[PDB]
Amino acid sequence: VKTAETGYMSRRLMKSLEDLSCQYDNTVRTSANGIVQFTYGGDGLDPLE
Amino acid sequence: TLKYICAECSSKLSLSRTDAVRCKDCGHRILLKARTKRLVQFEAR
Amino acid sequence: SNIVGIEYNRVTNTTSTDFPGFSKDAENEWNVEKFKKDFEVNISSLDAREANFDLINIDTSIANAFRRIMISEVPSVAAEYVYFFNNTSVIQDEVLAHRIGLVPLKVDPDMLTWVDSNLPDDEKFTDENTIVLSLNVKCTRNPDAPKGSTDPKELYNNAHVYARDLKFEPQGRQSTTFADCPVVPADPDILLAKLRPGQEISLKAHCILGIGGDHAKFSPVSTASYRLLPQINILQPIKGESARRFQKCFPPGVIGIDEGSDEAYVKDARKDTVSREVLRYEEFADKVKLGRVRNHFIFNVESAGAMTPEEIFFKSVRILKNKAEYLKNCPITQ
Amino acid sequence: HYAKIRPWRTFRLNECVCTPYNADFDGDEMNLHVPQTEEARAEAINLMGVKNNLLTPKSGEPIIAATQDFITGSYLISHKDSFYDRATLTQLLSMMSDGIEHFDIPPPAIMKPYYLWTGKQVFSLLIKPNHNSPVVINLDAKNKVFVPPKSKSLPNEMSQNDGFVIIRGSQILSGVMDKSVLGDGKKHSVFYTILRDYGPQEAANAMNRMAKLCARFLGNRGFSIGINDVTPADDLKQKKEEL
Amino acid sequence: YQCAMGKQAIGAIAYNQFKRIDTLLYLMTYPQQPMVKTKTIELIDYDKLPAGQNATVAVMSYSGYDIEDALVLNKSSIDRGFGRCETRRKTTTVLKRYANHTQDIIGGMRVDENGDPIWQHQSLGPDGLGEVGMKVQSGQIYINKSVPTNSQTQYREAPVIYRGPEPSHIDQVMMSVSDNDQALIKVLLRQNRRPELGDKFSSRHGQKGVCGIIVKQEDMPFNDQGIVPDIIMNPHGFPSRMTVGKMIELISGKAGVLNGTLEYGTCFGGSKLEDMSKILVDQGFNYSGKDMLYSGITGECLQAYIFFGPIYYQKLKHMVLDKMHARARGPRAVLTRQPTEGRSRDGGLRLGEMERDCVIAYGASQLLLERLMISSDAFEVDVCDKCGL
Amino acid sequence: EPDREKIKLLTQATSEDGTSASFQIVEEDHTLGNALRYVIMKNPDVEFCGYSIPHPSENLLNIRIQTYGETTAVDALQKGLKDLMDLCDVVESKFTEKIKSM
Amino acid sequence: RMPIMLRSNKCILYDADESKMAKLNECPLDPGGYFIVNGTEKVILVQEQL
Amino acid sequence: VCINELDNWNAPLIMATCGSKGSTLNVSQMVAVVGQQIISGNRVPDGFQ
Amino acid sequence: VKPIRGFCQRLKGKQGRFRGNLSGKRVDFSGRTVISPDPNLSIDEVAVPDRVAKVLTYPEKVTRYNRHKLQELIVNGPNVHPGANYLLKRNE
Amino acid sequence: MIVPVRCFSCGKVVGDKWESYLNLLQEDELDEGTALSRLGLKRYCCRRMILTHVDLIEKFLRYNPLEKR
Amino acid sequence: EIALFKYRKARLEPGTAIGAIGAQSIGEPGTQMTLKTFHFAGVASMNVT
RNA sequence: GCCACAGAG
Numbered sequence A: 001v002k003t004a005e006t007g008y009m010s011r012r013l014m015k016s017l018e019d020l021s022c023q024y025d026n027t028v029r030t031s032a033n034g035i036v037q038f039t040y041g042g043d044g045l046d047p048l049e
Numbered sequence B: 001t002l003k004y005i006c007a008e009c010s011s012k013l014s015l016s017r018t019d020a021v022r023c024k025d026c027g028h029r030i031l032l033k034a035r036t037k038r039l040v041q042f043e044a045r
Numbered sequence C: 001s002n003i004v005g006i007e008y009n010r011v012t013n014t015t016s017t018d019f020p021g022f023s024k025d026a027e028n029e030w031n032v033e034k035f036k037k038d039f040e041v042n043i044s045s046l047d048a049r050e051a052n053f054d055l056i057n058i059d060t061s062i063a064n065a066f067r068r069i070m071i072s073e074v075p076s077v078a079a080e081y082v083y084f085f086n087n088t089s090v091i092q093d094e095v096l097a098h099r100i101g102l103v104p105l106k107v108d109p110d111m112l113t114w115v116d117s118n119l120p121d122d123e124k125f126t127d128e129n130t131i132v133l134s135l136n137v138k139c140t141r142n143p144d145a146p147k148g149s150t151d152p153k154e155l156y157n158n159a160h161v162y163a164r165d166l167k168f169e170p171q172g173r174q175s176t177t178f179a180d181c182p183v184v185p186a187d188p189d190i191l192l193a194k195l196r197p198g199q200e201i202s203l204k205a206h207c208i209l210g211i212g213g214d215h216a217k218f219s220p221v222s223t224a225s226y227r228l229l230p231q232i233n234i235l236q237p238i239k240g241e242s243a244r245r246f247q248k249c250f251p252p253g254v255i256g257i258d259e260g261s262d263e264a265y266v267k268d269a270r271k272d273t274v275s276r277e278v279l280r281y282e283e284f285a286d287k288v289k290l291g292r293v294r295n296h297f298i299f300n301v302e303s304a305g306a307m308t309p310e311e312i313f314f315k316s317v318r319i320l321k322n323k324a325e326y327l328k329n330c331p332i333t334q
Numbered sequence D: 001h002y003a004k005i006r007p008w009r010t011f012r013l014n015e016c017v018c019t020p021y022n023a024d025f026d027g028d029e030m031n032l033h034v035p036q037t038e039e040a041r042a043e044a045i046n047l048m049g050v051k052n053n054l055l056t057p058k059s060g061e062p063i064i065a066a067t068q069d070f071i072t073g074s075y076l077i078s079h080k081d082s083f084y085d086r087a088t089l090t091q092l093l094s095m096m097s098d099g100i101e102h103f104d105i106p107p108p109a110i111m112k113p114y115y116l117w118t119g120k121q122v123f124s125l126l127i128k129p130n131h132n133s134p135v136v137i138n139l140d141a142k143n144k145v146f147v148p149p150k151s152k153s154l155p156n157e158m159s160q161n162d163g164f165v166i167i168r169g170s171q172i173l174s175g176v177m178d179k180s181v182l183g184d185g186k187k188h189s190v191f192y193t194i195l196r197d198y199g200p201q202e203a204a205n206a207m208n209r210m211a212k213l214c215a216r217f218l219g220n221r222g223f224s225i226g227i228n229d230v231t232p233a234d235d236l237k238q239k240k241e242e243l
Numbered sequence E: 001y002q003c004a005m006g007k008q009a010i011g012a013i014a015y016n017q018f019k020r021i022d023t024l025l026y027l028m029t030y031p032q033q034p035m036v037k038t039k040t041i042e043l044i045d046y047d048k049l050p051a052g053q054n055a056t057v058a059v060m061s062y063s064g065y066d067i068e069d070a071l072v073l074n075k076s077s078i079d080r081g082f083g084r085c086e087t088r089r090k091t092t093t094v095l096k097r098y099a100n101h102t103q104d105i106i107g108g109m110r111v112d113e114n115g116d117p118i119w120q121h122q123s124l125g126p127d128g129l130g131e132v133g134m135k136v137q138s139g140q141i142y143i144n145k146s147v148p149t150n151s152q153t154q155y156r157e158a159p160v161i162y163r164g165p166e167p168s169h170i171d172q173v174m175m176s177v178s179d180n181d182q183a184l185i186k187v188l189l190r191q192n193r194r195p196e197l198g199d200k201f202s203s204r205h206g207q208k209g210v211c212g213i214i215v216k217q218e219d220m221p222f223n224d225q226g227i228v229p230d231i232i233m234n235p236h237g238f239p240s241r242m243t244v245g246k247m248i249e250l251i252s253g254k255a256g257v258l259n260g261t262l263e264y265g266t267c268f269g270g271s272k273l274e275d276m277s278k279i280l281v282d283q284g285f286n287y288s289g290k291d292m293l294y295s296g297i298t299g300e301c302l303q304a305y306i307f308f309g310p311i312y313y314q315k316l317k318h319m320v321l322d323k324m325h326a327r328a329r330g331p332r333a334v335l336t337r338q339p340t341e342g343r344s345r346d347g348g349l350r351l352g353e354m355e356r357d358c359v360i361a362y363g364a365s366q367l368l369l370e371r372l373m374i375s376s377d378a379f380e381v382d383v384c385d386k387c388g389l
Numbered sequence F: 001e002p003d004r005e006k007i008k009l010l011t012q013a014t015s016e017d018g019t020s021a022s023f024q025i026v027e028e029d030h031t032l033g034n035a036l037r038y039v040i041m042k043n044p045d046v047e048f049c050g051y052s053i054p055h056p057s058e059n060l061l062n063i064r065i066q067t068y069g070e071t072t073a074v075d076a077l078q079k080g081l082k083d084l085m086d087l088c089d090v091v092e093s094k095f096t097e098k099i100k101s102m
Numbered sequence G: 001r002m003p004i005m006l007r008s009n010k011c012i013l014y015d016a017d018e019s020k021m022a023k024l025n026e027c028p029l030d031p032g033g034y035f036i037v038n039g040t041e042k043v044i045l046v047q048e049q050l
Numbered sequence H: 001v002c003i004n005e006l007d008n009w010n011a012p013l014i015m016a017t018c019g020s021k022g023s024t025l026n027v028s029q030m031v032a033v034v035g036q037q038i039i040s041g042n043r044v045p046d047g048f049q
Numbered sequence I: 001v002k003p004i005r006g007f008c009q010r011l012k013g014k015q016g017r018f019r020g021n022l023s024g025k026r027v028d029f030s031g032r033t034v035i036s037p038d039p040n041l042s043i044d045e046v047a048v049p050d051r052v053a054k055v056l057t058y059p060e061k062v063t064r065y066n067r068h069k070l071q072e073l074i075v076n077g078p079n080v081h082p083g084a085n086y087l088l089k090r091n092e
Numbered sequence J: 001m002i003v004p005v006r007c008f009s010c011g012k013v014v015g016d017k018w019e020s021y022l023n024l025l026q027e028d029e030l031d032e033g034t035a036l037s038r039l040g041l042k043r044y045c046c047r048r049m050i051l052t053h054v055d056l057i058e059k060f061l062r063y064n065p066l067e068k069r
Numbered sequence K: 001e002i003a004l005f006k007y008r009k010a011r012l013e014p015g016t017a018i019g020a021i022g023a024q025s026i027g028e029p030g031t032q033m034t035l036k037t038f039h040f041a042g043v044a045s046m047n048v049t
Numbered sequence L: 001g002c003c004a005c006a007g008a009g
């Protein structure tokens, strides 16, 4: 039964977070060019790297 | 050509063009087509 | 040392150590004279369907190659194609064809020729590469059966279709080549099918020769396997009642108690299936050790009935030698 | 993935890759799409490739690494009482490379009685086969089960049961290979170090070598579980009873 | 999980299973009763119609192909009938009589110029219904139904065409008359299947798994007597799942088959382990069922004892022949002009919201455009620049 | 007439002087590779002999032979094949004389 | 017309020996308890209520 | 007291040491006491009166 | 009475236009099969059945670097696996 | 449905031992574990082949469609 | 040199869909989470969700 | 075609 609620949670989270991206000036912005974060996580470091 | 088997009385019988789909020796209305006489080849595996 | 030691939880020293580079002495180079002097064969039993023989002072790779070639590379003759005329049984045609293909045929494989696959079916099967077996059984009610009987062998006429009903139909020169050795199944009592009145079976089976790797029905051996010679060392004498307990850890004929000193000694290590039961009991720790001789194989080759087990082993050795010769004669393409 | 063509009517993937999929071979069905344009093909192979995605973006830890039955075989090779002569060493080295890679046999760890190579030298050759391979990785890591040494002054590698693994150059000087060093979830693993220092191709090559070695070694060196491994000893049934 | 998968095991259905015409019926050629029984098995007469075979199992890591529940099968064991099964399917047709005093007909056999039936009618017979016992491939006809066009009337051809990945044999043809005096024709088709890669096997303790590899007998391990396991199962399935009952089943079955009597695995009871250990040690085997096996590849002794004995395995109804599907281009829906749904309609696989979002997470713009526009529903359209319509 | 497709020398894996080589042999499996491995490791000049079946679906066998500078790998392979032939001949002779003995 | 449950007291298979089961092409080990409607054998499942 | 007594080359012990499959708890449950059964954070609720 | 499929019913839900046909949709050139292990493949490889590979095709445009290869594939045809199923001409 | 011709594991022919096994159980009143050994079924893989066999062919033949039942 | 190279390659590359990555990296542990009973710092009467 | 349950991971 946990998958039924977890799928909806994931769908909501993605439909709220899909538009963000890291621009070429290292500022995370929405699709409407509004800043969410000035640097990603405060230091601009990739969690993958 | 005898081609059909009554499913109850097990009598080989043939159907013409105007014959009803029922056995002649009894009232059973289920007929099974008999095995063909043509060669069938199988691989023994 | 060449003794595979057997412990209570693991098996030690399982790999061959006879090659230069194992130590600074750099001995055990391949010498055909030394191998000719050291190798030994001892046949202990030789029946028409089962051979037991010891190969001594040979490496594990060669014996395993012989076993594998015996199982899946020595050709044998078995039914391959089945043509059906009016199979009215409960048993399906696929199942009946598979069962007929699984019967062993008493045919010498050297009297046939390999079937060329790319040839078309009109000329694929000739008198040199195909044995025809015809089966024709019709079951009818017994008119004079006992009233109180219930055995189908008495109530019906041909209620049991066996493998001995597979008659041999010579074609062409097989009328003269197979005159003194007619094709019969190796196990005539194989129960192929069961019938009831009104049912009939009639079929023609084309039998060719193939290897066991292609299908398991072509394997000439029902089983073909070896086992290392067991070895039981009694490091300290075992006296009295404990010896009787020491007798119960092994099969009955393996060890015995001498009547004079009343101590246990190994009588026949060959009968010892290695169950390592004696390693369970703490009293026999540091008193007995178990092992297997790594270069002492006891082959037990049981034939399926087509041909003798000694012929099977000889054919396996010849096949390995021919593989080596064929690889030696080939040119190496860059 | 790059496609290979096989005749056996099932999709087949390396078992190191079933962990991102959360897949087990108990009836799982998977899907296969084929991009139909050059741009889509290049984007898929350069952004979604297995080599370029060895690490999960959730934490940066490896997610494509040794799974079950590859950790066990590697542990049994790298066990402290594993000693191989030159024939078994050479067969193992050919078993991880399809008999193609050139191997430079190092001098043995034991010389006077016999010539015996430890399995840690086998994995040192697995990481770096010859002098032409550029993979030179150095790391220190703890295993899953680490038993600290007798004295607190002693270093971690002088512990019992080979708890601490040290790789200098490419030789494995201590420790065993387990889920901490070859599996997923830890940032001190061998494959993570190879990927970070020498690119994804060398990490993929090392994983392929490990998988090919452990897919053929554990059959010839058997590993089994029975009820003897589960039954308790005689005194345990009394200590448990009294407690 | 065993309670779930026992209802999907392939085996004998009933004593009249060959007189039945069911829409889907899986049968096993050589069913065997379990070596380790239960009182419930005897009470419900499950041993009279069993579903499964006693396979010689060596619990060991053989290749890399047994990882993650996958099983290693023996090719020689499969060649001798292990896991052989058959599938029987029913196709039914009704020759309905329309209100215009017109009815469907069955006869028809388009003979060629030489005097032989055409390829589509190669196994169709003179009466219009396919002959019993002959092989039907994809594209052939086994029911040659014709429908009057106006519903001397003219009949259009609406035949029943077999289609599938493998050929099938016509097992039974039946004609009858329903209650409303309309002719009913049923054709039961059978096809024989052997285990392959992807076929699902269960082991009566959960422990489900598909076949990962099929290897030859000489590549398999063997004991002193030459016994070769039919199924090799990975040891790594036991510790996380804790099926000690499976090991007890193996030892009970081994001791029973050496002693010659079926054993009982009855809940809160059954055959005790000490008796089976005594039986095993009296027969020259280890008390724990761990035999010493030589490997078939290199011939040397395995450096660990192998847990070796008979386990009852069930072949489940999920086989890869019924699951494989591929589309490329095919039918499209009339409304949305997108690929249809299901492999019965040659449909396409859905790239849902989660997969779309996973593709987004990689940053693959062109791959997303190709998957969601080019390959699914691309359409060239004319838009006005002024009114925007 | 000779079988050119039977045994091949994989150019990309051999050495320049022929000391190390890898040979691809078609239509063989462990039953010949293991015997060749055992026989070739008894050559004093061979320091590496190992076979492999890259995939069960392919009937193929890759065997790698690396020697010292005394002889090339091709000579080691030919010597191993001849020596395996001699081993089979000796086993054949002993078995066929012990059959006639009893 | 009431569709009768197989192997009930109104069925033809009630307290019938194995020979009569063979005469009617019915398996003696069939559990029974279902209804044959339009050729399909349907089972009325047990319902759980308060 | 169960884990410290099992000898080397014990397959569940090896598989727990590797981390390939299983844990110490599973071995202890198979060889020794299974332990308390916990439902919703508590012990077994009073199904009857 | 079953409620009719109005215009709003065609747009809402998981089977509507937005979630069933716009955000995600069924695609061509896709296949689904049971998976089984194969350790001999590299980690960046997947093994596809030859039956599936003969259905799933890739449209390769003929260049000056691959003309002979595609000629050979066309010659082999749809039945031999290293082949081709369709040809689309430049002017057609 | 009928006794298999060959043992699945090794390959020994056990299809000719079914009638003899039934005769030794019925006429000679031997126990099931000794009749198997008297027929040469030493390996347990062969013993399970006819010890666990269910002869369903007799039950299937009661519904003969070619002859009144 | 190694430290500076590792730092300069660890920056978040422009164009990354970092919002989708975060949404997935939050949703997926929700799938992996099993439901357990917790308490607030050693007292059993809290049962904080 | 629409519903209805049945299963697979």
Ligand SMILES: CCC[C@@H](C)[C@H]1CC[C@H]2[C@@H]3[C@H](O)C[C@@H]4C[C@H](O)CC[C@]4(C)[C@H]3C[C@H](O)[C@]12C
Pocket (backbone or CB within 6 Å): C110, C310, C311, C314, F096, F099
């Ligand atoms: C074309 C191949 C022929 C080959 C299969 C024939 C021709 C020569 C035959 C052997 C010799 O007769 C010597 C022995 C005689 C004993 O009685 C049985 C074994 C024995 C080794 C024979 C086996 C077999 O019968 C051989 C090898």
Ligand SMILES: [Mg+2]
Pocket (backbone or CB within 6 Å): D023, D024, D025, D026, D027, D028, L009
């Ligand atoms: Mg699963």
Ligand SMILES: [Zn+2]
Pocket (backbone or CB within 6 Å): B006, B007, B008, B009, B010, B011, B023, B024, B025, B026, B027, B028
């Ligand atoms: Zn009649």
Ligand SMILES: [Zn+2]
Pocket (backbone or CB within 6 Å): E384, E385, E386, E387, E388, E389
């Ligand atoms: Zn306009």
Ligand SMILES: [Zn+2]
Pocket (backbone or CB within 6 Å): J007, J008, J009, J010, J011, J012, J043, J044, J045, J046, J047
């Ligand atoms: Zn057997």
